[PDB]
Amino acid sequence: TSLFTTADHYHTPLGPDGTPHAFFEALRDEAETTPIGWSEAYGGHWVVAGYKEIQAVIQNTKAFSNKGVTFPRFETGEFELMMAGQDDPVHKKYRQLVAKPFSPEATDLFTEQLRQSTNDLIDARIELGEGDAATWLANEIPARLTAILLGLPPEDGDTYRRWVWAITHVENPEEGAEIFAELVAHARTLIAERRTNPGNDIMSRVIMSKIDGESLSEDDLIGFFTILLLGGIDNTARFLSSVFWRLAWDIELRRRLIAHPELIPNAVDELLRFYGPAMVGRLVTQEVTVGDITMKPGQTAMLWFPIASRDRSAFDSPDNIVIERTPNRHLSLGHGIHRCLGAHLIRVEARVAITEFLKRIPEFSLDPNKECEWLMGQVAGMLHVPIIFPKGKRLS
């Protein structure tokens, strides 16, 4: 019996703690023998689980194309995910347009405003003694950030969340496509406004940009809007919700972060290794051999980062959250030419969120009368994390 045969990142067995980690640990064990295996799911595809096998695949851009970055393909109609869905040379030119606003110096500019935002969100319920850390905090922090990056109203998070649900999780394709079509309609109006009244945001930036002398098509612009919205509302919210869930029951990890705030950035990196939401696919475009296995053009390889992140040949004690772990070269943010554009920004965001939360609410736990829930998929993590805590005071 192999766990690869029915491996499916949208349908991962959950264990008693509520997470797929027991399943990930079992798959990791098997990957020591078979680091790449065939899955029967989605009509058949390769599941790449070993650390060095994922490295080999992801560096080999000649045989493995980012046209398969989402598998099954995300619902973005006729639009492509910019950067993430392209290969070089096209990929490099698009990414170059937004490197500056994602650079560490550019994104550090938001730290103090992320800190205020986190404290304001906390104020909303600190007096209540209860709340869903996902919906109340983890979702809202990146949504509000992302709205400001894109020059959108920050109070319309429920609209952006609905768009992201359509792209990734609605299963009736009619609803899926239709709601993505609503994103497109909003995106066009914003582009038209920024065209005439340009601002500081990243959208105005790409709208005014040029490649080889020429403006970006409206479709290219919509692709930029789309992938940026996905990074914030989806990946970051799921990551933070898993972190909040962990901090809720893991009283040992929590007291250490409270006592050693200087360890929080390194801890954020270890939490990324352990709770990294993401997997990505690659479309095989050339016959290629990786380890014992020969892949053919047209096949897809799914890079199961959470398994590689637990590889005993790449990490000592991989099943433990070791907050002082260095160098910690996990694959949660990718590697090589497609390496996460928002890497530094999420590190700031997580450091701020954790810092402020533990500062305001040092004592809290999972609500024993409400359920947690894990969202499965290409972006995976806690979706509901009901917590209780002693009633406290607003800063406002």
Ligand code: HEM
């Ligand atoms: C915890 C949060 C996040 C995680 C785990 C994550 C994960 C990843 C991964 C694994 C990749 C590599 C894709 C590949 O190899 O095909 C990637 C790329 C990318 N990410 Fe992130 N991401 C996060 C947040 C964000 C945010 C906040 C943004 C921007 C607002 C963002 C924007 C991008 C873009 C544009 C790419 C494509 C880069 C390229 O193709 O060169 N991500 N991300």
Ligand SMILES: CC1(C)O[C@]2(C)CC[C@H]1CC2
């Ligand atoms: C799943 C993953 C990693 O997140 C986004 C935002 C970046 C790359 C891919 C697809 C979209």
Ligand SMILES: [Cl-]
């Ligand atoms: Cl290690």
